[PDB]
Design an enzyme around this catalytic site. Sequence first.
Site, mmCIF file in Angstrom:
data_model
loop_
_atom_site.group_PDB
_atom_site.id
_atom_site.type_symbol
_atom_site.label_atom_id
_atom_site.label_comp_id
_atom_site.label_asym_id
_atom_site.label_seq_id
_atom_site.Cartn_x
_atom_site.Cartn_y
_atom_site.Cartn_z
ATOM 1 N N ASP B 66 -5.477 16.631 -1.428
ATOM 2 C CA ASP B 66 -5.332 16.414 0.016
ATOM 3 C C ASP B 66 -6.621 16.554 0.816
ATOM 4 O O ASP B 66 -6.921 15.712 1.671
ATOM 5 C CB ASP B 66 -4.274 17.352 0.600
ATOM 6 C CG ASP B 66 -3.825 16.930 1.999
ATOM 7 O OD1 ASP B 66 -3.528 15.729 2.192
ATOM 8 O OD2 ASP B 66 -3.751 17.794 2.900
ATOM 9 N N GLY B 93 2.411 1.048 -0.790
ATOM 10 C CA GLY B 93 2.894 0.130 -1.798
ATOM 11 C C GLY B 93 1.865 -0.344 -2.791
ATOM 12 O O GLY B 93 1.131 0.453 -3.383
ATOM 13 N N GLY B 94 1.810 -1.656 -2.973
ATOM 14 C CA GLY B 94 0.888 -2.221 -3.937
ATOM 15 C C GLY B 94 1.707 -2.592 -5.160
ATOM 16 O O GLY B 94 2.807 -2.074 -5.346
ATOM 17 N N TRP B 95 1.178 -3.473 -5.998
ATOM 18 C CA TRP B 95 1.899 -3.917 -7.181
ATOM 19 C C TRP B 95 2.317 -2.799 -8.129
ATOM 20 O O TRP B 95 3.472 -2.711 -8.550
ATOM 21 C CB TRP B 95 1.066 -4.947 -7.951
ATOM 22 C CG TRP B 95 1.767 -5.425 -9.175
ATOM 23 C CD1 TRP B 95 1.617 -4.946 -10.446
ATOM 24 C CD2 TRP B 95 2.802 -6.414 -9.238
ATOM 25 N NE1 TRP B 95 2.501 -5.573 -11.299
ATOM 26 C CE2 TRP B 95 3.240 -6.480 -10.583
ATOM 27 C CE3 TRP B 95 3.403 -7.252 -8.289
ATOM 28 C CZ2 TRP B 95 4.250 -7.349 -11.005
ATOM 29 C CZ3 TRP B 95 4.416 -8.125 -8.714
ATOM 30 C CH2 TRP B 95 4.824 -8.162 -10.064
ATOM 31 N N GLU B 142 6.053 -5.178 -3.026
ATOM 32 C CA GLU B 142 6.060 -6.437 -3.759
ATOM 33 C C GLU B 142 7.147 -6.509 -4.844
ATOM 34 O O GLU B 142 6.876 -6.214 -6.003
ATOM 35 C CB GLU B 142 4.682 -6.649 -4.385
ATOM 36 C CG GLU B 142 3.567 -6.715 -3.359
ATOM 37 C CD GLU B 142 2.173 -6.653 -3.967
ATOM 38 O OE1 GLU B 142 1.991 -7.071 -5.135
ATOM 39 O OE2 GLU B 142 1.244 -6.206 -3.266
ATOM 40 N N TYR B 143 8.375 -6.890 -4.490
ATOM 41 C CA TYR B 143 8.793 -7.274 -3.136
ATOM 42 C C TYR B 143 10.272 -6.924 -3.008
ATOM 43 O O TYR B 143 10.977 -6.799 -4.008
ATOM 44 C CB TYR B 143 8.676 -8.793 -2.947
ATOM 45 C CG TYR B 143 7.289 -9.350 -3.118
ATOM 46 C CD1 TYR B 143 6.738 -9.531 -4.395
ATOM 47 C CD2 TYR B 143 6.498 -9.633 -2.007
ATOM 48 C CE1 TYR B 143 5.425 -9.967 -4.559
ATOM 49 C CE2 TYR B 143 5.181 -10.077 -2.156
ATOM 50 C CZ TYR B 143 4.652 -10.237 -3.432
ATOM 51 O OH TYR B 143 3.350 -10.653 -3.566
ATOM 52 N N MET B 210 -0.569 -12.780 1.039
ATOM 53 C CA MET B 210 -1.418 -12.559 -0.115
ATOM 54 C C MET B 210 -1.533 -13.905 -0.798
ATOM 55 O O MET B 210 -1.040 -14.123 -1.911
ATOM 56 C CB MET B 210 -0.808 -11.498 -1.030
ATOM 57 C CG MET B 210 -0.743 -10.098 -0.381
ATOM 58 S SD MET B 210 -0.013 -8.844 -1.479
ATOM 59 C CE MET B 210 1.761 -9.293 -1.377
ATOM 60 N N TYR B 212 -3.257 -15.578 -2.741
ATOM 61 C CA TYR B 212 -4.161 -15.614 -3.893
ATOM 62 C C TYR B 212 -3.350 -15.220 -5.122
ATOM 63 O O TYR B 212 -2.139 -15.031 -5.025
ATOM 64 C CB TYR B 212 -5.375 -14.695 -3.718
ATOM 65 C CG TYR B 212 -5.068 -13.373 -3.075
ATOM 66 C CD1 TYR B 212 -4.272 -12.428 -3.714
ATOM 67 C CD2 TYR B 212 -5.555 -13.080 -1.804
ATOM 68 C CE1 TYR B 212 -3.965 -11.218 -3.099
ATOM 69 C CE2 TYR B 212 -5.258 -11.881 -1.175
ATOM 70 C CZ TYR B 212 -4.465 -10.952 -1.824
ATOM 71 O OH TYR B 212 -4.187 -9.761 -1.197
ATOM 72 N N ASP B 213 -4.003 -15.089 -6.270
ATOM 73 C CA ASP B 213 -3.290 -14.787 -7.502
ATOM 74 C C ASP B 213 -2.302 -15.938 -7.726
ATOM 75 O O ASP B 213 -1.273 -15.770 -8.381
ATOM 76 C CB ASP B 213 -2.510 -13.459 -7.421
ATOM 77 C CG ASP B 213 -3.417 -12.241 -7.318
ATOM 78 O OD1 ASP B 213 -4.590 -12.330 -7.735
ATOM 79 O OD2 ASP B 213 -2.948 -11.184 -6.834
HETATM 80 C C1 LIG Z 1 -2.719 0.628 -11.704
HETATM 81 C C2 LIG Z 1 -3.187 1.574 -10.600
HETATM 82 O O1 LIG Z 1 -2.356 2.133 -9.892
HETATM 83 N N1 LIG Z 1 -4.490 1.776 -10.441
HETATM 84 C C3 LIG Z 1 -5.449 0.985 -11.179
HETATM 85 C C4 LIG Z 1 -5.846 -0.225 -10.345
HETATM 86 O O2 LIG Z 1 -4.736 -1.012 -10.085
HETATM 87 C C5 LIG Z 1 -4.866 -1.923 -8.974
HETATM 88 C C6 LIG Z 1 -5.486 -3.240 -9.436
HETATM 89 O O3 LIG Z 1 -4.671 -3.822 -10.435
HETATM 90 C C7 LIG Z 1 -5.600 -4.208 -8.274
HETATM 91 N N2 LIG Z 1 -6.042 -5.498 -8.779
HETATM 92 C C8 LIG Z 1 -7.160 -6.054 -8.316
HETATM 93 C C9 LIG Z 1 -7.450 -7.476 -8.747
HETATM 94 O O4 LIG Z 1 -7.948 -5.468 -7.562
HETATM 95 C C10 LIG Z 1 -4.243 -4.376 -7.586
HETATM 96 O O5 LIG Z 1 -4.425 -5.056 -6.399
HETATM 97 C C11 LIG Z 1 -3.313 -5.774 -5.925
HETATM 98 C C12 LIG Z 1 -2.485 -4.927 -4.963
HETATM 99 O O6 LIG Z 1 -1.581 -4.113 -5.661
HETATM 100 C C13 LIG Z 1 -1.697 -5.947 -4.130
HETATM 101 N N3 LIG Z 1 -1.625 -5.536 -2.791
HETATM 102 C C14 LIG Z 1 -2.359 -6.368 -2.027
HETATM 103 N N4 LIG Z 1 -2.565 -6.334 -0.682
HETATM 104 C C15 LIG Z 1 -3.360 -7.253 0.069
HETATM 105 C C16 LIG Z 1 -1.927 -5.288 0.050
HETATM 106 O O7 LIG Z 1 -2.953 -7.360 -2.745
HETATM 107 C C17 LIG Z 1 -2.591 -7.207 -4.126
HETATM 108 C C18 LIG Z 1 -3.809 -6.858 -5.000
HETATM 109 C C19 LIG Z 1 -4.263 -8.031 -5.887
HETATM 110 O O8 LIG Z 1 -4.726 -9.046 -5.042
HETATM 111 O O9 LIG Z 1 -3.669 -3.107 -7.249
HETATM 112 C C20 LIG Z 1 -3.504 -2.233 -8.373
HETATM 113 C C21 LIG Z 1 -2.765 -1.017 -7.863
HETATM 114 O O10 LIG Z 1 -1.525 -1.397 -7.291
HETATM 115 O O11 LIG Z 1 -6.808 -1.009 -11.060
HETATM 116 C C22 LIG Z 1 -8.038 -0.282 -11.283
HETATM 117 C C23 LIG Z 1 -9.024 -1.239 -11.924
HETATM 118 O O12 LIG Z 1 -8.418 -1.963 -12.983
HETATM 119 C C24 LIG Z 1 -7.764 0.963 -12.141
HETATM 120 O O13 LIG Z 1 -8.960 1.719 -12.282
HETATM 121 C C25 LIG Z 1 -6.684 1.827 -11.483
HETATM 122 O O14 LIG Z 1 -7.185 2.390 -10.276
#
Ligand SMILES: CC(=O)N[C@H]1[C@H](O[C@H]2[C@@H](O)[C@@H](NC(C)=O)[C@H](O[C@H]3[C@H](O)[C@H]4N=C(N(C)C)O[C@H]4[C@@H]3CO)O[C@@H]2CO)O[C@H](CO)[C@@H](O)[C@H]1O
Lengths: 497, 496
Positions: B66, B93-95, B142-143, B210, B212-213
């Site tokens: 923290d 969030g995030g993937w 997502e999603y 988003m 892209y991808d």
């Molecule tokens: C798996 C994890 O929690 N941490 C990983 C880290 O994961 C990242 C990457 O996979 C990101 N990929 C890239 C190409 O940077 C990924 O980005 C996603 C994101 O989840 C989505 N959200 C958005 N927004 C605009 C809000 O866009 C997408 C992007 C892809 O465009 O996010 C995951 C975590 O969710 O990966 C790093 C390096 O491999 C690893 O060290 C570790 O920290």
Amino acid sequence: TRKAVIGYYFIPTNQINNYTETDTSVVPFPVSNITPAKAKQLTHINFSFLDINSNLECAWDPATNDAKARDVVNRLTALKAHNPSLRIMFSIGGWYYSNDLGVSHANYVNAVKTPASRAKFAQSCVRIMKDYGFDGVDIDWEYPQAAEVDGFIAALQEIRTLLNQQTITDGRQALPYQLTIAGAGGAFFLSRYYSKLAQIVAPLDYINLMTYDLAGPWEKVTNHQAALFGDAAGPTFYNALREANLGWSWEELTRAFPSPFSLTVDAAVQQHLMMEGVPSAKIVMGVPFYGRAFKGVSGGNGGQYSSHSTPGEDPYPSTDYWLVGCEECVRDKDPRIASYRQLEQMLQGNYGYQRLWNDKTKTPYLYHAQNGLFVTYDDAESFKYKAKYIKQQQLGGVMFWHLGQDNRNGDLLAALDRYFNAADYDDSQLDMGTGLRYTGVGPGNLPIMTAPAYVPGTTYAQGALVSYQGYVWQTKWGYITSAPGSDSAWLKVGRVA
Amino acid sequence: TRKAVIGYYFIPTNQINNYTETDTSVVPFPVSNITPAKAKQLTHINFSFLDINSNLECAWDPATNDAKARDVVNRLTALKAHNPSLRIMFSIGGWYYSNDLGVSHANYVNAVKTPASRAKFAQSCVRIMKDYGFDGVDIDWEYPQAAEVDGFIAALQEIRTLLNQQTITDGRQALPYQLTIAGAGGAFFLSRYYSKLAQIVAPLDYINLMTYDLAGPWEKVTNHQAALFGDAAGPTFYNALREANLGWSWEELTRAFPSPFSLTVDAAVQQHLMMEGVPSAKIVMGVPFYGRAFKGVSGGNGGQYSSHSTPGEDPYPSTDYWLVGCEECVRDKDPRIASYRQLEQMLQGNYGYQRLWNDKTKTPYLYHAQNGLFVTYDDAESFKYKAKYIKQQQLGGVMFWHLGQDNRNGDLLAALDRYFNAADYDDSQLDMGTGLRYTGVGPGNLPIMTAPAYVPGTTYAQGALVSYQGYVWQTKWGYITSAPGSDSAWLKVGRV
Ligand SMILES: CC(=O)N[C@H]1[C@H](O[C@H]2[C@@H](O)[C@@H](NC(C)=O)[C@H](O[C@H]3[C@H](O)[C@H]4N=C(N(C)C)O[C@H]4[C@@H]3CO)O[C@@H]2CO)O[C@H](CO)[C@@H](O)[C@H]1O
Ligand SMILES: CC(=O)N[C@H]1[C@H](O[C@H]2[C@@H](O)[C@@H](NC(C)=O)[C@H](O[C@H]3[C@H](O)[C@H]4N=C(N(C)C)O[C@H]4[C@@H]3CO)O[C@@H]2CO)O[C@H](CO)[C@@H](O)[C@H]1O
């Protein structure tokens, strides 16, 4: 169970008023033509037409001489003496009274609006029925639409409960009063109320499909007005059903209503069976006792599928009566239509018509090479294939428009009754042909399919099949991690046994 | 009105727990990289990612220090002293956390299930915000599936309600708290909630697409992951939108969703504009600050639209680090992705990569003829077309993932800012090209037309046009005897 043979009997107000059974120029087809033997060939005779007045009640054309009216209806009900199962229904509507621009359309629309209007209307129907001696009510509104449907449905249910009560009251349990309606036989008009077929057919003993007029001078290409099955060489149309508010996905609409498609009797019948809640036993296939004529047809193919110079207006705009030998046309002022009776007399009059036959559509047609004339109609032969179609598909029976257009001997009606009931008639071998069948499959008539149960947490590739919650679903794309059902990734394709 | 430049900023729990601004080997891109000048090029910096825990509340990754977290955020909010319009948002969030099969997926599904759960979650969102000093909430789930949509919407509405209140309570009329989400940039995922876009967007300041991808080693053929427009030579896809719970007629569905179609940025934007109640001003185009690599591609078209041998599973299934020159790929243990910063170094390291350019998709790509490598990515050049597109379509602005992937000179950030605000930049002569535009037409992007007022009692032939209820309609067949909106033979094809 016996197949229904519902014959509408149309008699113009003018004829009722000048009713006679001895003057073919006034009443071309009087009731006296139906003998006890002919009465035995029918299950129902639908008197046409009554209407709905500005008072929102079922009534006769105000111009009708009531006494003469009751007299014509009496000659018909008298037939019941020679047939314990014969029913004399009266039909409300008809194209002229009920179409959108019909003189009485507002009355149909308004009568079905509220509980009050529906109660009053339905009540007037039973009154009329009991007042003149009819055995049931047939509604021929062409056709309810949009906001109108629910009213129409509530009206039908109302009439139903009243009839059933009257049945009890009159102790008519052996021959219950009946309710039916004449339904659209083509996707265009059918699209209006299609989404609610089940609710509509629910209170009915039968829905009489008007599977004819699927071709006519109002179309740019000549064709059969009642082809049983399709002919690839014939024209096709956009399938208007996929514009009905059904709530189905693109895939569902596409698989349910292929398009373009051949507008045929088979298509209309199949489109009704597609829907959930529509029993085939209530479906009655309509057939025509009249043919439609075209002029300005090019040769090479019997006049079929040709451009033509035929007026499509109503009424007939010219004074030129070009359907050779059709004196009936002259009398009625329209060379574009003729009764089977007249048509037959024409084939009898050595006028230059050739009687042709299409083995795909299973229907006859006349070609006048000389004058470039084309006529589409049905006969005892085409009725053979249709009668068998009825048996095969287990439909409620056959309907026709109309009794007064049969030849003096009533060969068309006798044929129909013969194909269903005659001991010495046998169609076990009749070949139905290779004509195109309507094969739309909707979420209502889904086939039984087999597939592994869906597994949560699994990622599926495109085209993958699984069973889930009573159905077999297939993915329309890959990497789908969602469950089958609400989500758009899955397509319901079959039912789980 | 200034275009939004929304830069997501992703810093893994490991990097936060070891935060240092003096060791690129530990924290490659610390906050100190965002100099005052760079801070002025941004309108938002979305800190990523916060999650939704089992208590169904918004919260930092459990393993997070923290104290370290707050110091990192404070550095970020400190950045505001150099830009009074800058907002430091945080994204939930995030993937990895919220995907159907992600670690916290259940929490997202439950958090929005009940009025009580939504109320609790919504409040946890504001509490985190006010507590760490953020300027708004960004939801990146997502999603949500089709059944979780109404709850997702209600939840957004609840969050909007609380934020508008906080804004007053904190006297932030000048810089009101905001609420946005990262939305799908492709039909497949978009189709989950597409039908209710309007309700989803209503409570938001912006929906960050988003876009892209759109390509990756999980697809059979190599392609541009973020093509602005379509290339006929490229692969086409099934238009999932036509299967959304829309309740539209075949005709309506077919004209809104041509299929197959080209999976592009333009396609995504148009798909959003097609829906009614979805204002362009709230649409923000996402751009990637990273490239996607493929291997075992063949030649003939610069590695494009070629079959390949790149594994698609996450995590990368082997230890074979084949992206030549990509040391970042070795460190992150995945040769299928490289930061723009890494790509640039690979390009300047003369490792045998060629920067080619597709003038249809208006995007760059790298091709390694020797090893058979293909890399789809974006740069300052493709950003010109997208920036113009943003202007022409009157979109809210641009968004990107993510700040930490730019090069030390902040070239990509600078490009975006320049294309929108530099007085000496001029793209009026810039040619958008002949690449394939998405042609679908919907309730929300109907053309303006003129047609004779419908006349009750008239019979219309097939193809007739009439004006009714402020719209122009066309008959789908002939002998149409009833009015538009009552007779299904009428198709609404225009407005005004
Ligand atoms: C798996 C994890 O929690 N941490 C990983 C880290 O994961 C990242 C990457 O996979 C990101 N990929 C890239 C190409 O940077 C990924 O980005 C996603 C994101 O989840 C989505 N959200 C958005 N927004 C605009 C809000 O866009 C997408 C992007 C892809 O465009 O996010 C995951 C975590 O969710 O990966 C790093 C390096 O491999 C690893 O060290 C570790 O920290
Ligand atoms: C104008 C009027 O009220 N009476 C006309 C009369 O009109 C008839 C004819 O046009 C009929 N056509 C044919 C070929 O018989 C027409 O029949 C329609 C009927 O309305 C629909 N109802 C059914 N059912 C099965 C219930 O089928 C269709 C048939 C067509 O298949 O009906 C109108 C009346 O509505 O025409 C005659 C001369 O043609 C004229 O003298 C006058 O009496």
